Amino acid sequence: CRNRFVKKNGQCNVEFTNMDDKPDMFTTCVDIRWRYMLLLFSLAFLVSWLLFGLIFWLIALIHGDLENPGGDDTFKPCVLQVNGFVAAFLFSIETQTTIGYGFRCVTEECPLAVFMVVVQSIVGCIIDSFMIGAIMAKMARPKKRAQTLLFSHNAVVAMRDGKLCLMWRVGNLRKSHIVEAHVRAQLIKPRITEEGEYIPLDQIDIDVGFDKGLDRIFLVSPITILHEINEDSPLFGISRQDLETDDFEIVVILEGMVEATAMTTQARSSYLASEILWGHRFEPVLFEEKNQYKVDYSHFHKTYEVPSTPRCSAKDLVENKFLLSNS
Amino acid sequence: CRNRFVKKNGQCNVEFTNMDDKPDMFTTCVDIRWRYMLLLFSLAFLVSWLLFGLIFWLIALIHGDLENPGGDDTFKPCVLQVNGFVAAFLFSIETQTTIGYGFRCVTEECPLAVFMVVVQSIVGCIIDSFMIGAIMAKMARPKKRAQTLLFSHNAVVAMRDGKLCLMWRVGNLRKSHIVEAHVRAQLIKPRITEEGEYIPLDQIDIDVGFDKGLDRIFLVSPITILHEINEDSPLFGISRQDLETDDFEIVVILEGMVEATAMTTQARSSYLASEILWGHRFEPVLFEEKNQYKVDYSHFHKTYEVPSTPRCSAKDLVENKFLLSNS
Amino acid sequence: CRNRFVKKNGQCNVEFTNMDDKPDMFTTCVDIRWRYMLLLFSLAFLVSWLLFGLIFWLIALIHGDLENPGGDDTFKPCVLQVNGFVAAFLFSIETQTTIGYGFRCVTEECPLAVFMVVVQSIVGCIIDSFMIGAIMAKMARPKKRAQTLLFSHNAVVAMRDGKLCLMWRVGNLRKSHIVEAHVRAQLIKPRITEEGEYIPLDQIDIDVGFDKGLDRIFLVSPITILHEINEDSPLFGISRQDLETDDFEIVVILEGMVEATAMTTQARSSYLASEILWGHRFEPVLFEEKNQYKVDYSHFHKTYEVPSTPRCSAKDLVENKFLLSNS
Amino acid sequence: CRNRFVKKNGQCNVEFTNMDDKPDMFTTCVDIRWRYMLLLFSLAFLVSWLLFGLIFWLIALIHGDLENPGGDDTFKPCVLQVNGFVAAFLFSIETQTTIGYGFRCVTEECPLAVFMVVVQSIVGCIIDSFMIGAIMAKMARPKKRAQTLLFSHNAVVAMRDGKLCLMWRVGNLRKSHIVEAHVRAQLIKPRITEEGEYIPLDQIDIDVGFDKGLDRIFLVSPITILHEINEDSPLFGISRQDLETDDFEIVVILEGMVEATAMTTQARSSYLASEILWGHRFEPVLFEEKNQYKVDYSHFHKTYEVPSTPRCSAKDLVENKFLLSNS
Ligand SMILES: [K+]
Ligand SMILES: [K+]
């Protein structure tokens, strides 16, 4: 009844508080939402359009263009047809977007106006490039990527090849592969060291074959991950009855390079002591039909009872062999 | 005669069925075909062009512009020269593309029309950016990348340095390298555990040197991968005659970071029991000519018989030594 | 009092000198600062605008356009309305930016002028593309990325589970995870080999569990890294009093794939002999409140004394057991 | 005198011949040279500009526009001011580039002409996007990236800590780090197995500490890589005199994730038997000056003689100890 450290869906159940400070662009960019980033960029356009519009309007005002927007034989405006702020605003937009309808058109008359068109051209170009890049950042780096990996709802304890094992099933929801895929597991419980030190949650490795490289998996059809419960296992002393009492949690991990997303992935899940099914085995999901193999995923989470499974702990199992040898 | 789990070309022979649900953009993007994605984008242009065209047409209609498109001394249209829907449509296109010929040109007269030009400018800019990004997504993340790695058509069993070995050849088709390249192999067969549990396809590691780090290869010219068949090998009890009987499959893997594609790669192949050549050795592909080394790839798949190869299993080989020692 | 090889913040304290030579674009690009890269691109625009402007001006000059910019019935200019260098300059800008107001407009009259517009169009397009790319390079590859990982200010020496240990704490400042995270540590001191060879700084591994795969960590809430001090440890012979004398440094590393930045990361820190707190333990940062777990980061760096901690070295600790056994 | 398998600069000395076939875009793109890719894109522009120009010219021809380009009260051209092929060509360019000067301007008159402007707009947009992407491909994936890692010109054999060792030096030419850096080495020679099989070049691991994880290095200042020559070493039986006779090659590798280029890297070099200096040691490159450490890279390749170095092989060294024990 303690609590869930990692949720069934992989989400971690911890919140951070009281964090100190630092007084980056790429991370900041991908962290913001679409609607806000698009609002941001449209704001960037408006502001720059309005700014230059204001400048061209000032220039026109001072030059006397407002009273002679089309010019004549004796008089040439800085920008043709700026008759007021709305016109200046339009000329700004038309310049920066590069629409350039041309009714409002810069002339050779004013160095400053020519300068301002050069500047706005460069700015408009810079802004666009930043928008193209930010849109790719948030594009190729989404926070929501759909889980490509499935863990079974339950783990189970059963005999395989003379050994009592903790077992859980992993699967790939896509035809795409996972490169250099490998698995890990941890038992999560609080504990007090013999020296009296309290460890709120201790993370204790569950051996899935790392030392022989057998934690490395080639995952096509769903695979059943195996933990042999032995002297070195944290579950060594745990019997079926201990299970309905004990408060602990097992975190399971699958890591690898997903050929779809191109990025290294960590898929997570969790089994509470109460979510482990003793004396059970998974229903087979894999079937061969003539020319081809098929996986039926509706059997993925399903299990069946194996009543011949011993109800004592692995430690009892071992100790009993040594007890009936000597006598 | 059972069936092929992995095809010679690396393709996996399994199909998934009965999958449950989830109710992403980047993955969705790269999964669609070119012609459809290009059709999609052209559709995006049409729709937005038609939409704004419709809006400018409504504005023109209500303002009375249709009857005075060029305006006069007493009357100024919202957008010059919109005389009907085709003209409005053109003005829309010309605005969003930023072509801006200028015959059809927005004026200062109508706040709403100016507003709409601003909006369309932003939208056109957003659309373009998404097209530039999607085209890179599908660009830098192709599904068809040409296999850069070659496995020999056959594996073989022969003596090397006093040991009976399973051997197969791998090669790089490019001058480009593979960083942190390493190999793996698995024997694939169904089996029943002593407890009566049926495993439709069990995946059993074939030791290629992982424990000594010898599974790690520096691949320039083709290399012959070696599996010593010993007590711990699944092939320990298999003789030449067992081979023409037995139903099983060996999957071979090569993983590494391809310096060409920049992405971590898994190259796969398969050898059926019937595709393993007992008492054979690969023809050498590597030759030194004066100043330089050359590889002749026409010898890559070729093998020759070594009649002195023992036809008994490795287990017989060992057991026989112990049988002629003691006597 | 020797010196700091690695700073507390991970920065390395070494400078390179007397480096020889090589007589790339992507690296060169990301190495330059924003303001200089933006200045660079604006310079690229100016230069190309000025160049073509000069060319159109020459063409106009030679054709006689300067004296008849608008043309007439008997005479057609190469580019309409180029009346001087400022006009030519404007036409250049208007062409390359694709603003194209159209008052200055190329005609069918001069093959060379048409040619030049084609060329400038291609160049302007090339320049833009390079600017869009460079801006992404520097965008997705920043030098300043905010440290996502925290090391405790101090390490400590205390008993855990019957063993004297060197301990330090690591933490993730973000809810984002670290894929395939693992840790390392080194003792840095100069030394002289028995053969008389001087090694200015020798880097000696501190065992954090690599051989059992226990150097691999699943990091959610802060974790305390453990080095058991034993026969094989460089700290085996070091007591509490040796600590206030000895001159040495311990470098701690955490490597992994950060799910935020998408890139493989190396976080670093350092503990001088004087920064190690003997007979101390870290304050717990992790607390369970009902439905959820919380981390209080204000306790991250904090420690408390454990007076029962032995002040002798691990070697003394061992040797003393063997001394009181035999008697 | 045999030959060089790997050049001092890391380049591999092998050429492939007689390769079979496959009947991708991203790889193909980055493989082509700049000048050709830029020529390619400019060709793409020309072709599309010429094509549509031809179409608008046909349309104009058939409509009768060539004889009335400006139109009048009773007659409206499909595109204003197309008076011939040069004009049509200009209108094409002006449309696709989106310059849109506007002297040549499409009208509402011809559905086909409007259609063609829509099509060309989409095509021009597609072409541009492909150019922006290809330029990034070749941008972020260069073939020439400057070597960031240096190997010493020579290896050496000397005693360190009671053991005869093969040694070579590696260094980072940049302040940038290498994440998860690790080293490897191989002895390359042809050999004949006891069964009579010829291996043109056999690649035999040289143990740099892989089993203890000591092949993993934290590289700041140059480091001297160590191979202890022992029973399991291929160099076990090699003395100083054997060195001036023997024909063999040692390939050295350094792999890691370069924080600069963001990509996993393999740096390579080679030492011929003749390039190994027996009874030598590297000059120290690292020096501490007060507040800071410095590396002098002009000492990087330099070595000095250690006359006390034994000239016999490691095997002799061992065997001699056992010879003077027993007597
Ligand atoms: K334009
Ligand atoms: K334009």
Ligand SMILES: [K+]
């Ligand atoms: K125009």
Ligand SMILES: [K+]
């Ligand atoms: K090991």
Ligand SMILES: [K+]
């Ligand atoms: K990796």
Ligand SMILES: [K+]
């Ligand atoms: K225009």
